[PDB]
Amino acid sequence: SDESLAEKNKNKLQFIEDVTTNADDVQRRVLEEILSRNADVEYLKRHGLEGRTDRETFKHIMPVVTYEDIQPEINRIANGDKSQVLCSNPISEFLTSSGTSGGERKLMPTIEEELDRRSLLYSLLMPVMDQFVPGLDKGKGMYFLFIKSESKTPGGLPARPVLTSYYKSSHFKNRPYDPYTNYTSPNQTILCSDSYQSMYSQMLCGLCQHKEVLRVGAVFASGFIRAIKFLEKHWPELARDIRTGTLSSEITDSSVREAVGEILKPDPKLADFVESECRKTSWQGIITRLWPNTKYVDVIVTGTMSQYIPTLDYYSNGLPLVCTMYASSECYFGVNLRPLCKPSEVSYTLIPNMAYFEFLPVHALTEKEQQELVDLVDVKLGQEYELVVTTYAGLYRYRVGDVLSVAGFKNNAPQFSFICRKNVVLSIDSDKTDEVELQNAVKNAVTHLVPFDASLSEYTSYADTSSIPGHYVLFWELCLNGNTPIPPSVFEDCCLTIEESLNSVYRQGRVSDKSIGPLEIKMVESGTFDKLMDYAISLGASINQYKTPRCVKFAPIIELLNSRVVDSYFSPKCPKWSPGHKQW
Ligand X SMILES: N[C@@H](CC(=O)O)C(=O)O
Distances 550 to 435, 437, 440, 566 between C-alpha atoms, Å: 7, 11, 11, 20
Distances 204 to 52, 219, 243, 400, 456 between C-alpha atoms, Å: 56, 19, 12, 38, 48
Please identify, using beta-carbon distances, which residue of 39 and 420 lies nearer to ligand AMP.
420
287 binds ligand AMP (CB under 6 A): no
Q: Which one among 304, 336, 430, 501 touches ligand X, defined by CB under 6 A?
A: 430
Q: Which residue is nearest to ligand X (CB)?
A: 161
Q: Which does 302 bind (CB under 5 to 8 A by kind): ligand AMP, ligand X, none?
A: ligand AMP
∠ CA 478-484-487, rounded to 5°: 70
97 binds ligand AMP (CB under 6 A): yes
Q: What Rg do the C-alpha atoms of the chain give, in angstroms?
A: 25
DSSP 18-65: HHHHTHHHHHHHHHHHHHHHTTTSHHHHHTT-TT---HHHHHHHSPPB
Q: Which one among 162, 290, 319, 350 touches ligand AMP, defined by CB under 6 A?
A: 162
Please identify, using beta-carbon distances, which residue of 38 and 328 lies nearer to ligand AMP.
328
E strand residue ranges, 383-531: 384-390, 398-410, 413-421, 424-426, 433-434, 454-464, 471-480, 520-524
3-state SS, residue 560: helix
Burial of residue 394, with CB atoms counted within 10 A of its CB: 0-12 exposed, 13-18 middle, 19 or more buried: buried
- Minimum Å gap between C-beta 430 and ligand AMP is 6
∠ CA 137-298-512, rounded to 5°: 120
Stretch that binds ligand AMP, among 97-105, 221-229, 530-538, 562-570 (CB under 6 A): 97-105
Give the Cα separation of 379 and 137 in Å (integer). 37
ω into 451 cis (within 30 of 0): no
| Contact status, residue 246 vs residue 539, Cβ threshold 8 Å | no
- Minimum Å gap between C-beta 541 and ligand AMP is 30
Q: Which one among 127, 139, 161, 517 touches ligand X, defined by CB under 6 A?
A: 161
Q: Which one among 9, 149, 184, 302 touches ligand AMP, defined by CB under 6 A?
A: 302
Q: Which does 323 bind (CB under 5 to 8 A by kind): ligand X, ligand AMP, none?
A: ligand AMP
Site string for ligand X, 485-504 (x = CB under 6 A): --------------------
Q: Which one among 100, 311, 329, 528 touches ligand AMP, defined by CB under 6 A?
A: 329
- Minimum Å gap between C-beta 104 and ligand X is 12
148 binds ligand X (CB under 6 A): yes
Q: Which one among 402, 434, 492, 499 touches ligand AMP, defined by CB under 6 A?
A: 402
162 binds ligand X (CB under 6 A): yes
Give the Cα separation of 162 and 97 in Å (integer). 8
∠ CA 355-581-115, rounded to 5°: 30
Please identify, using beta-carbon distances, which residue of 414 and 575 lies nearer to ligand X.
575
| Contact status, residue 212 vs residue 140, Cβ threshold 8 Å | yes
Report the Cα 584 to chain-centroid distance in Å: 25
Q: Which one among 303, 352, 469, 509 touches ligand AMP, defined by CB under 6 A?
A: 303
Q: Which does 148 bind (CB under 5 to 8 A by kind): ligand X, ligand AMP, none?
A: ligand X
Q: Which residues bind ligand AMP (CB under 6 A)?
A: 97-99, 162, 300, 302-303, 323, 326-329, 400, 402, 418, 421, 430
| Residue ranges binding ligand X (CB under 6 A) | 98, 148, 161-164, 329, 430, 505
